[PDB]
Every structure is written in structure tokens, then in C-alpha cells.
Amino acid sequence: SGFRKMAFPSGKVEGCMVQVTCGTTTLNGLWLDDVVYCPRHVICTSEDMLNPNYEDLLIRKSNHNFLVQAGNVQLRVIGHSMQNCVLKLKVDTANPKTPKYKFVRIQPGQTFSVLACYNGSPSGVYQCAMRPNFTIKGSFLNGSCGSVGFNIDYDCVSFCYMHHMELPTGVHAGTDLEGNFYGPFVDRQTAQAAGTDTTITVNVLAWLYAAVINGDRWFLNRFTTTLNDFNLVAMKYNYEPLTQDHVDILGPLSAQTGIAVLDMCASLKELLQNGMNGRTILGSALLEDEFTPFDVVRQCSGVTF
Amino acid sequence: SGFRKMAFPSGKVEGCMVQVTCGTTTLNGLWLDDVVYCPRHVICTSEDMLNPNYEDLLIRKSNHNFLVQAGNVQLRVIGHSMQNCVLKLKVDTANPKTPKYKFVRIQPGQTFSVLACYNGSPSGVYQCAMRPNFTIKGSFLNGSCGSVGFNIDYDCVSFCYMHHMELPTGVHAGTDLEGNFYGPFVDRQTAQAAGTDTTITVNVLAWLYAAVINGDRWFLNRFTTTLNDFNLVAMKYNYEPLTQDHVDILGPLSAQTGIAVLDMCASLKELLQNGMNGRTILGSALLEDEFTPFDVVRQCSGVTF
Numbered sequence: 001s002g003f004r005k006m007a008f009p010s011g012k013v014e015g016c017m018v019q020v021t022c023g024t025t026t027l028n029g030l031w032l033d034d035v036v037y038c039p040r041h042v043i044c045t046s047e048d049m050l051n052p053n054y055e056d057l058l059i060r061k062s063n064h065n066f067l068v069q070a071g072n073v074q075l076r077v078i079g080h081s082m083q084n085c086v087l088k089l090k091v092d093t094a095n096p097k098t099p100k101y102k103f104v105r106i107q108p109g110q111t112f113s114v115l116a117c118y119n120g121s122p123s124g125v126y127q128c129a130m131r132p133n134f135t136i137k138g139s140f141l142n143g144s145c146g147s148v149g150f151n152i153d154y155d156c157v158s159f160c161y162m163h164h165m166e167l168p169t170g171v172h173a174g175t176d177l178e179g180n181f182y183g184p185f186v187d188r189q190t191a192q193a194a195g196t197d198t199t200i201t202v203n204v205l206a207w208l209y210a211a212v213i214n215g216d217r218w219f220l221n222r223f224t225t226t227l228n229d230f231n232l233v234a235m236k237y238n239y240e241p242l243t244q245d246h247v248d249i250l251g252p253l254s255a256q257t258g259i260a261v262l263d264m265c266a267s268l269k270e271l272l273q274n275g276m277n278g279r280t281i282l283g284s285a286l287l288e289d290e291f292t293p294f295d296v297v298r299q300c301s302g303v304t305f
Numbered sequence: 306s307g308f309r310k311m312a313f314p315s316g317k318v319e320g321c322m323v324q325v326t327c328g329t330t331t332l333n334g335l336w337l338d339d340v341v342y343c344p345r346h347v348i349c350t351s352e353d354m355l356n357p358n359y360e361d362l363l364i365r366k367s368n369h370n371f372l373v374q375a376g377n378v379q380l381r382v383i384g385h386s387m388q389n390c391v392l393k394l395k396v397d398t399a400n401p402k403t404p405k406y407k408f409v410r411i412q413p414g415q416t417f418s419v420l421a422c423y424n425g426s427p428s429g430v431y432q433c434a435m436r437p438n439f440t441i442k443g444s445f446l447n448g449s450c451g452s453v454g455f456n457i458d459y460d461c462v463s464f465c466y467m468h469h470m471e472l473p474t475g476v477h478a479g480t481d482l483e484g485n486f487y488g489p490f491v492d493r494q495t496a497q498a499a500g501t502d503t504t505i506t507v508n509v510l511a512w513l514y515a516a517v518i519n520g521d522r523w524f525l526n527r528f529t530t531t532l533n534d535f536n537l538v539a540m541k542y543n544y545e546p547l548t549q550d551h552v553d554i555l556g557p558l559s560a561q562t563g564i565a566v567l568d569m570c571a572s573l574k575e576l577l578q579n580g581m582n583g584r585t586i587l588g589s590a591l592l593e594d595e596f597t598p599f600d601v602v603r604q605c606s607g608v609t610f
């Protein structure tokens with residue numbers, strides 16, 4: 001028993017990380033088959049970042065201006081192209097460590113692991129959620145751009161995130177691996193606001209299920225509630241509306257625990273209106289919304305990869 | 306910026322995980338050179354575990370009673386020995402993926418990463434602290450025994466923990482890689498008490514520094530305190546006393562933020578006496594004590610492996 005914020009094992013992604021240097025600028029790239037993916041702002045001067053014209057900056061760049069290093073082996077760049085906010089560098093060698101992989105665009109509320117890297121070398125791994133306002137609460141210093149987010153299924157790495165920037169509020173923004181930003185952000189050094197962020201109601205419920213399995217059952221109540229009744233209280237606290245799809249997603253947890261979904265909703269409604277009166281849930285004094293229902297099942301059933 | 310509970314990249318350890326079976330009992334082993342290390346209770350049945358005589362049980366076992374799989378290849382066991390609570394299984398081929406490694410006995414208050422495994426395959430990675438009462442707050446199901454905790458120093462993997470059991474309070478207990486339990490525990494299915502746990506004061510301070518680095522500074526006050534005055538209050542709240550060794554360890558963090566250790570101690574002294582007043586620190590309503598000063602420096606300055 002016990003419940004921890006758990007990342008995927010990173011080994012398959014570690015073997016794809018490389019260092020990419022353009023002039024004064026070094027960051028991380030992802031090396032899959034014969035292609036290295038990285039943020040296109042590798043080509044920028046620190047001046048350029050205020051308002052980069054990326055098309056014109058790239059024209060001044062030849063293949064030899066891109067230094068790609070994998071371990072201590074320089075890879076030879078034989079082509080370059082810009083797709084949205086990512087740069088694709090063709091190299092003369094395919095990564096022998098390329099795992100089975102897919103590029104995916106995740107949905108707000110879904111989770112993934114981040115392998116934070118510097119100079120092409122992995123430094124640590126942690127689990128994030130895509131917030132409803134399309135930011136992530138990460139841990140990223142200068143030099144970390146090019147770090148990627150991913151899920152794993154058995155043997156397949158689903159790449160869903162590449163890191164590009166921090167907002168004034170201290171949260172993080174990035175692209176999918178096709179270079180398309182999540183949310184309304186652009187890759188330049190300027191004031192950028194994220195939306196108001198809501199709480200991922202379906203994830204809080206899944207987490208409450210995990211808590212019950214694990215000994216924290218004091219918030220369960222005799223009362224019940226309807227979906228519409230529950231949702232009226234949810235808006236008041238800035239929680240995402242709960243839909244029948246969300247109910248159905250929670251179905252398996254309901255079954256394994258014998259706690260109907262709307263009974264847990266009733267417990268969450270009462271937690272929201274009255275707080276925790278000195279008790280904790282899975283060691284936290286705040287409701288936690290960055291475990292999906294699948295995360296909860298994976299962790300409480302020992303799913304492997 | 307940002308501050309997350311961050312595990313070490315796990316690839317070097319994933320390549321050493323294997324499945325170990327003896328009769329009806331399957332758990333994880335750690336394959337380094339031509340030795341597989343696993344918990345000795347792999348040789349027990351369910352009944353045996355109420356009160357095992359491990360020496361007698363091992364005598365009934367032969368090399369061929371031990372089934373070791375590395376991926377889908379079977380490794381032939383050619384020798385076996387008990388060392389304290391771990392079994393050493395000599396195999397016919399050395400692990401080509403063996404990292405540079407050390408076996409270390411860690412100290413209470415130190416942290417490490419756990420690669421939680423089932424049937425020899427990794428399911429996830431997370432950061433734990435060895436509590437002052439020599440338990441860890443992990444996430445372990447049946448089948449997870451033999452999972453290891455470790456730290457990485459550039460290319461060197463320091464293995465410090467192997468998982469063996471769960472206590473009635475829901476926390477976890479295990480051994481170093483020589484088979485010596487942390488704390489007063491035995492590998493038998495009986496109710497066992499850990500002591501009263503205490504809060505790792507030096508770690509809370511380190512986290513307060515991480516909070517300031519990252520924009521949560523409301524708790525800073527203009528006072529200072531003595532190590533003796535501070536420790537009189539700490540002990541009222543079940544905090545480990547702070548020594549001069551602890552101050553010195555916090556020195557570099559002090560220097561990088563310009564906040565003297567004893568000024569942060571004054572801040573923590575107020576937080577304990579006045580509570581947080583519904584404010585949060587790094588997204589927490591509670592004081593966090595599972596980040597060491599080194600964890601904070603490494604994350605807030607980008608050390609890589």
C-alpha cells in the first residue's frame with residue numbers, strides 16, 4: 001500500500017537525449033531514428049529572443065552551424081527544417097536506441113512524466129499534469145528546453161510534450177512534438193498570461209478513491225448527491241464540471257472499492273464546503289488533482305512496462 | 306524555476322532488474338556482474354512467513370529451485386548464499402548493463418529514488434526519505450519486494466535500499482544491499498512497531514530556502530534566533546534538534562540566497578508557533594521534510610548525471 005506521485009521509468013527516453021548547440025546557444029534535443037527534434041529557439045541570440053523572426057534567423061544557418069552531440073560523439077547534421085516551433089535536424093546516423101514510439105497531443109487533465117535535462121544529459125524525472133489552462137507546474141531552469149514529456153505503454157513511448165518556456169506566474173509552457181504549443185503561447189521573451197486555471201474534478205475523485213484503498217476513509221459520508229447537484233457546488237469552487245464520461249471513466253475504481261461514483265462526489269462536495277478539520281488525505285492537507293483515474297489504477301494494481 | 310519531488314533518471318537501474326522465482330514465490334532481483342541479489346523470503350511459502358527458520362528453509366533449496374529471468378532469457382543459477390536477509394544468487398553470465406556502483410548504508414534524513422518493480426519489470430520511480438525511525442513512506446504492493454532504492458553520482462549508482470515489507474501503520478521497511486535491515490525490523494509476518502517518527506528539521510529548512518528561491522517568501526521575518534532557543538521550540542513540535550553540523554550543511558544555501566541559516570531558523574520557529582494561516586508554501590499546506598539541502602541545490606542549480 002501507499003500512494004506516491006510516480007513517474008514512468010525513464011530509461012527508454014534517456015537513450016534518446018542529445019545536446020544541440022547553435023553558436024552561443026545550447027539546449028536538448030530528442031534523437032529518434034535519423035532525426036533530432038529540438039526547440040527552434042536554439043538558433044536565437046539572446047537579443048533575438050525579444051522578437052525573433054524565426055524564418056529569417058534560420059536562413060542564416062547552415063547545417064554545420066548545428067552541433068549535435070550524443071554522449072561524446074558528434075552527430076553529422078545533413079538537413080534541417082522548421083515545423084511550427086520545433087526544428088528537425090536530419091543526421092547521418094539513426095539512433096540504435098530508438099524505442100517504439102508515437103507522437104501524441106494530450107488533453108487537459110492528462111498526466112505525463114518529464115525527464116528534465118541539461119546539456120543533453122538527464123538530471124531527474126517527475127510527473128506533471130496538463131492544467132486546464134494548458135500550462136504545467138514543472139521544474140525547469142535555463143538550459144532545460146528540449147526536455148520532453150512522455151507516457152509509456154508496455155514498450156511504446158508516447159511523446160507528448162517538449163519544453164520551451166516559463167510564464168510570469170512561475171508555470172511552464174511547451175509544444176507537442178510537432179511543434180504546436182499547448183495553449184495561447186508563442187516562443188518569445190514577452191509577458192504572456194495563461195487562462196484562469198480550474199481544478200480537475202475527475203482527478204480529485206480518483207485520488208479520493210486511492211485514499212480510501214490506503215486507509216484514509218474518514219471523509220466518506222452517508223449522504224448522496226446527483227450529478228447536477230454536485231456540479232452546482234463544483235462551479236462555486238472553480239472545479240471542472242463532471243460529465244457522464246467522467247463518471248464512466250471512474251467506473252472501474254467504483255467497482256473495485258464498492259463506493260458508487262456519486263457517493264464519492266457527495267464526499268467531495270462536503271470536503272469542499274467544510275475542509276478537512278485537521279485531518280489529511282494521503283498525507284496532504286489539500287485536495288490533489290494531478291492523478292488521473294488510470295494513474296490510480298496503474299499504481300494500485302502494479303502495472304509494469 | 307519551480308520545485309518538484311524529483312527522482313533520479315532510472316535507466317541504469319532498470320537494466321539490472323530481473324525476476325526471481327522459487328516455487329510459488331516470485332519477486333524482483335538486482336543483477337550486478339554475475340550476482341543477483343534478492344530478499345531471502347523468496348524461499349518461503351505463505352505459511353513459512355509467520356515464523357521462518359531461514360537457514361533450514363535454504364537447506365531444502367538447490368540452484369535449480371531458483372528461476373531467474375532477465376527479460377525473456379533465463380539466467381542459470383550456479384551458486385547461492387545467504388547474507389543476513391538477502392540471498393545472493395550466482396549466475397552463469399554477468400550483466401552487460403552493470404553500471405559503476407557502490408552499496409551504501411544511508412543515514413536517517415537522507416533521500417533516495419525507488420524503482421518500484423513487479424515480476425522484474427519497472428512500474429515507476431519516486432523519491433523517498435529514510436525517516437528518523439528507519440521506515441520509508443513508499444508505494445509497494447505484493448510482488449514489489451526486491452525493488453531497490455538508489456542515488457546516482459554522475460555515472461556511479463549508489464544502491465542503498467532493498468524493499469522487504471510493510472508495517473501495520475502502512476509504512477515500509479527494508480535492508481541495505483548487504484541484507485541488514487534499517488531499523489529494528491525482522492523479515493517475518495508479525496505485527497511490528499516503528500518508533501515515533503520525527504520531522505527532519507534540516508530538510509524543512511532546505512525546503513524553506515527552495516520556497517524563497519521560487520517566490521514564496523511571505524514567511525520571512527526580520528528576527529534571528531540562537532540554535533539553543535530554536536531547539537527548545539523544535540522539540541515541543543517533535544522536530545529533530547538542529548546541530549552545528551546541520552547549520553554548516555545549510556551554509557551554501559544560505560550563501561546563494563543571502564539568508565543566514567539562523568534567520569531561516571527564526572522563520573521556521575514562527576511557522577511552528579503560528580501555523581501557516583491558510584497560506585501555502587510551494588503548493589503545500591504542510592511543512593515538507595523529504596528534501597535534503599543537497600536535493601535543493603541539485604534541483605535549483607541543474608546538476609546532471
Ligand SMILES: *[C@@H](CC(=O)OCC)[C@H](C[C@@H]1CCNC1=O)NC(=O)[C@H](CC1CC1)NC(=O)/C=C/c1ccc(C#C)cc1
Binds near residue numbers: 028049168
Ligand atoms: C529554455 C531555454 C534553453 O534551454 O535554451 C537557452 C539555453 C528556457 C526554459 C525557461 C528558463 C527559465 N525557466 C524556464 O522554463 N526557455 C526560455 O527561457 C524562453 C526562451 C523563449 C522561448 C524563446 N524564454 C522564457 O522562458 C522567458 C519567459 C518570460 C518573459 C517575460 C516575463 C516578464 C515580465 C517573464 C517570463
Ligand SMILES: *[C@@H](CC(=O)OCC)[C@H](C[C@@H]1CCNC1=O)NC(=O)[C@H](CC1CC1)NC(=O)/C=C/c1ccc(C#C)cc1
Binds near residue numbers: 330332333347471492
Ligand atoms: C513483498 C514480498 C513479495 O514480493 O513476496 C511475494 C513474492 C511484500 C511487500 C508488502 C506486501 C504488501 N505491501 C508491501 O509492501 N513483503 C511482504 O509481504 C512481507 C514478507 C515478510 C518479510 C517476510 N510481509 C509483510 O510485509 C507484512 C507485514 C505485516 C503487516 C501487518 C500485520 C498486522 C496486524 C502483520 C505483518
